[PDB]
Amino acid sequence: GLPWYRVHTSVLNDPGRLIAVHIMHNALCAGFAGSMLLFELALFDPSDPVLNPMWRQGCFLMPFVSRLGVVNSWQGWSVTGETFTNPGFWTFETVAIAHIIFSGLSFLAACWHWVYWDVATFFDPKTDEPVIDLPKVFGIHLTLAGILCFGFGAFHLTGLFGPGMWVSDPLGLTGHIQGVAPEWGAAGFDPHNPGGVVAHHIALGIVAIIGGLFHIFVRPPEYLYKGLRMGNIEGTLASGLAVFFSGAFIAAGTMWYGTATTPIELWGPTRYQWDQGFFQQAISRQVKASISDGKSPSEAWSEIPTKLAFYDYIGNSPAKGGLFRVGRMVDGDGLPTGWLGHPVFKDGEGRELTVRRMPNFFENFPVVLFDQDGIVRADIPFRQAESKYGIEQTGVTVSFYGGELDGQTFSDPKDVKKYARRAQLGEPFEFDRSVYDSDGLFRTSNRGFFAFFHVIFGLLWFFGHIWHGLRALFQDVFSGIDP
Amino acid sequence: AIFRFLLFFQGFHNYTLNPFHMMGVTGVLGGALLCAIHGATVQNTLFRDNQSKNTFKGFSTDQGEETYSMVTANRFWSQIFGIAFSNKRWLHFFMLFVPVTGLWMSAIGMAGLAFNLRAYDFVSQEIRAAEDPEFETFYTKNILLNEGLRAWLSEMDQPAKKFVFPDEVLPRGFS
Amino acid sequence: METNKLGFVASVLFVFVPTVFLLILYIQTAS
């Protein structure tokens, strides 16, 4: 309690002050949630959900708020897009204001519990030393968690008495909020299945209600009371820190891999949707279906939605930003103003050329144009003194289908050399980097930042778990071993 | 395979520029410094607890007394380095703390490199070097070396990708 | 130099918000 790194152990033997200092952590957490959402909304651009979604704008708390049910603001707008006039009561502001009011109430309650520490709840009847019954309290808490789980998954996610949850199509274009029926079969363990989430919470709510009832009427065995140091509250901290760091790793993994809980209208695409060309194959499949529906190439390629083309930007891969490229994604490439259309590069021999897209690994990539055979036919040279290939030496022309340059053909070396650079970054888009003073260097999404922070949290909570487990077991020898 | 991993991490990740790795390097180098300096300081502040010139027999396991003068060691390092340890327990906790925290900080840096969250570049200098074809720092010469590594490794590093780079897009430095 | 503007104010609160804490702790120890 005397070293600076031990000072909060002054409440370790004072459970009224322990509750006080917990209610203060609650006040700070909720005040941070309220203030952060207010700051996330002062900086939010809701003008268009197609080219400026929340994941491009650095929205951290907004996806988590809107994933359950709170998508619309009191201003009219909605992250799904529709403006109206009666947005319920549970808007983006009401949530932040509820957390601010809760924070104020919790600050006052922590003040009360700091002052009135000596209440006869925290001292047993037989002696007067401060104690809390950890098995009993654990059972009560586990039961409370069980009802909250069961209810949240069976009434808020089902929508019986709740908003539902965000569901989406695989392409991530029809993102909306609806109540999801539970999925009890093998299909409930599909990561991209919201009924699995609903059924998980239901089943684990029954499980935690039963375990909490079992941890309120059955006292622990005498071997496991001394074995796991069940009288030591530090041991409870160690096991909770274990749950905390392994959840962080699971949360970070399911954010990086994408589950039904993190849909791409809120956190954007994963790096693994760019690695395998997920939206690229989706668009090619849709295009060829339209081509075989008796439509022209330009007519098929202009039914590709701008939101479906925008997912093929490598600038929207969350594995492309940097540790100290701070901020929102549009602080980097900029504000997208429109889809330039599918570029089709053709050599001087009239052969379909494809620019090799760049992977997530590469900060910059050699622009090399292949063909159906896959042999190099043009590229943007470096040595340019034995360069048998090259745009101007081979006369490569780019023709756009769809988008803003529908039907346009370019044959200038400067113009083909520019659009072959934009073709390796995926579907070419026009970027205005004047609105956000964008520096031009890619930034990761909120998906990437959350995953990376919660991995750091998993690592330090692994150590904190170890520290407190070792401190709980080796309590007798902390000051030293023996003379 | 580890050597390839090291050079891959420089060329693709610019991992020397990663500050968590710089603290890792600092922690590991300081751990080695502490190991060497503490061993030599103990060995050179020994007490005359024997008669032979071989001072390794001047220590018994059962004895409860210090085999080296902490006072002479504190005096020496105070008048050589300006500071010295005076607390033996703090000294040996420091010897624990330094390489462990370095190694943990490097692990934080790797956790960042899993998501490609990289300290690859300084945006101010990638900008200035591109508006000024005269602005050369050692950092700009590291960025060029990284591009050279990347293009000249990746076609046989990952052979599932089938990277085809013609000889005339490979960044050469004009041999 | 196109540097972060708040990178100045991030640098100085990163290094003097802890510093005053230490001085508070030291001064109350010394008195």
């Binding site: 309690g1 | 710089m22 603290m23 300290a119 | 540097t3 290094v15 510093t19 702790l25 030291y26 120890t29």
Partner: peptide, 30 residues
């Protein structure tokens, strides 16, 4: 017991703060 911070701990804390801030300043400025 009240909290302490002796002189040596103050100097150690000041250096770790000051050197860590000097390290991370270059990246906060970017």
């Amino acid at each position: 017991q009240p909290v302490e911070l002796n002189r040596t701990s103050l100097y150690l804390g000041l250096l770790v703060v000051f050197v860590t801030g000097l390290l991370f300043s270059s990246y906060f400025f970017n």
